[PDB]
From a paper:
Baculovirus Autographa californica multiple nucleopolyhedrovirus (AcMNPV) has been widely used as a bioinsecticide and a protein expression vector. The DNA genome, along with the baculovirus basic DNA-binding protein P6.9 protein, is encapsulated by an enveloped, rod-shaped nucleocapsid; the major capsid protein VP39 and some additional minor proteins are known to comprise the nucleocapsid. Here, we show a 3.2 Å resolution structure of helical cylindrical body of the AcMNPV nucleocapsid, composed of VP39, as well as 4.3 Å resolution structures of both the head and the base of the nucleocapsid composed of over 100 protein subunits. Surprisingly, the C14 symmetric base had nearly identical features to that of the apical head, except for that in the central regions. Both the head and base could be further segmented into three parts: an outer shell, an inner layer and a central region.
Author numbering:
A (entry chain L), B (entry chain K): 112 to 338
C (entry chain M): 6 to 158, 198 to 271
D (entry chain N): 39 to 157, 193 to 271
Amino acid sequence: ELINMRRYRNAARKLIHHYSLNSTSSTEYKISDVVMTMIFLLRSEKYHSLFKLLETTFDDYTCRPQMTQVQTDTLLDAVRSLLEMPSTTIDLTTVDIMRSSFARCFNSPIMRYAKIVLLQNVALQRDKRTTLEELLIERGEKIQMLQPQQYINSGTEIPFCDDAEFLNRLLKHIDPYPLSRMYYNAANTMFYTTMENYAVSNCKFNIEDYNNIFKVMENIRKHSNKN
Amino acid sequence: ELINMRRYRNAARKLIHHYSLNSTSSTEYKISDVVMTMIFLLRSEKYHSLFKLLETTFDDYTCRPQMTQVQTDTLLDAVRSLLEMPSTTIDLTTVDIMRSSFARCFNSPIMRYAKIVLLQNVALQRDKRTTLEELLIERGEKIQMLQPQQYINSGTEIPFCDDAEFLNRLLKHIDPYPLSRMYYNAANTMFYTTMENYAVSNCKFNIEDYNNIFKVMENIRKHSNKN
Amino acid sequence: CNKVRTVTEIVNSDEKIQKTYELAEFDLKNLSSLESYETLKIKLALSKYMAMLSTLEMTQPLLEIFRNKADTRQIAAVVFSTLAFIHNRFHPLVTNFTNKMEFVVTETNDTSIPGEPILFTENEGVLLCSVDRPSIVKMLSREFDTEALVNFEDFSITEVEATQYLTLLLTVEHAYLHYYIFKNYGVFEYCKSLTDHSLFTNKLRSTMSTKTSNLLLSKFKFTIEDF
Amino acid sequence: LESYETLKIKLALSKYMAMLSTLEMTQPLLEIFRNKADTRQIAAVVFSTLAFIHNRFHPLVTNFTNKMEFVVTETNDTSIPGEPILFTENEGVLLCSVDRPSIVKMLSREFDTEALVNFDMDLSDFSITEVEATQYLTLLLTVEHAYLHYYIFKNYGVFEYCKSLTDHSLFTNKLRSTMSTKTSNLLLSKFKFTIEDF
């Protein structure tokens, strides 16, 4: 039809890859991009589950659809098919993350140049806001309960390969590998997974300071006023 | 049936009013209004022409579509139908102005989950042998970038505490201090600083030749070869 | 050359303070300051880690190793060996783990700790190394982008594959920082670092206790995109 | 002749110290340059030293015939390797840019103190140290290099000034004792000094 299936399918693929915390690369977004994504979701009956979930989430979060296991499983399979990735990597966690992301995006006035804000806040667990330290101590109690799984006493000496030929061949194989991009990907992935953990466990965290404190403190004492 | 046309059309009425009377008003509206308007427009067969027209308004705003007068006539009919406003103040020019308003609104950036900005410093190590003049010009381009701060341009006679007592006390106090040691220290410090800078910048500096030119040429042609 | 000879002479006299130096400092600053040398160092450390893993009697690739929910023996050994590698890198004179460690590997929500996927504790003289399978598999399932976005500002190894090993290396870096802080001081200090991380400025100065070492992240400085 | 010229040299150094005291800067020179925040005092020192060199070189003209500005940079990328005093004219006004880190390196380089050549009254007074005198001498010589380049720039075009920046052999065209360029011991002609490189 007048809608380009390929264009809108790929645009929706990008939007889900990003707003569902599954991808790393960031592409600057426009409103028409999300409009095309949602239109493509509309045109496909199979993804009408997410499409109508978005429709419900347009107005407010005083309600959430009530579904059985069958609808959820079919929705999960549809999302897996859209992502074309390993299937079990998303689950209701990713579903709720995407819902909260899209709900936050749909609300709020249109800004001149982006907003650049995390979505951990007011995302999950409408119940309360519990202290992080108490969660640490309580969950550590359950961690230290039972079943340590390995008793390694003597310790095995670390294996070392002094054959430079293999080290040089590995080095040659890392020749095409750019350190900057790889490191950027690794840091971004670690940070996003930590943010997911903070969101899911509902332990509020110093978004702008604590991790920034890690970085700043470590770099500063690595270079300046080491003494 | 699954789609509420009434609310979609009601929001679209205000949105089209604002965007057709050239009242942008980004404060009033969000993405939800735009997407509801787009869905309602795509819903009926009547506005498929307008949907096709706005398709290329998403990204390529320099390509003027080629259309005849009859197609524009039917499009004007659709515009009068949607606006529900008399065609006295409605024409193709206002339609195109509204089109530009929609394109500008569509291309607005919205929000991101932020990103670990791994750009920072690299120290710009060329990893090759480097010349003198190329480094001088390339560095001087960044030297003259911005921020002129110190503004001392008046022009004044140099202040002098012309009293000899201050001079005499100092001059008597400098008697035990040799000149050879001081001049050695100054020259040695200059040599160390220059070699440090060349080591940092990895510039091909004459091992012991340019500063030798300084020394010998200056001293000798001061002493002789006066001209 | 092997010698750089410096002299400061004198008018109407012949005595000179003739000093001779060496190229060790100049060339050493050139090479260490050169980014190629530090890139070589980073690639060498990564190659040593890869050779360690290959000689670890592990033929299955990393993510495939972490997919095995049934046996956590391989995952525990991987974490153990990476801890051993970092312990080597800080203090080369020590290789083995003199204390016998036990791994409590979990796949539950409660045991997951938001910020330290591998928490390390002690319980009546026996050392506890928490392994959080859900968080680490979430980390290793983010489909790193590989297109050329450098933004400078024979083997079955690719970009994203070695990227996962690098991410694991950074995770073990944080874990080992916490472990070393715990071992140098009391449990209160370790937990307070887990809550503030301020002890990074206490003992890790480049001295006998801690002898420099890159820590990897010193190669690339990274910041948040805050306002 | 050595006694006379030594007296003249120490008199010139005393005048240098006296002028830099007349600048009325409460901060010490080493702390003058350590302070990355305030460029006002450092640029004042540079401007006053340029005035000192200009007037010693040209006693007959006193008032400035030029207007000058200063830009202070504290990064590796800006630092020209060898001439931390970046002096040029931009849009009808001369600019004397400075690389502070190079200078704070220079004035903190474990100055030699031992004489390796091997050969009522008193009370509180103006006391000086060998390190401070050596630092002042190094600063004066550096700004003298800057003023040599400025004079080449004035007496030539910017093209020839740049070619001098490439060669430095062009100092000897005009700086001799003349009715225009008034002689002067120049604070470095007092001693010859050569390298013994292989």
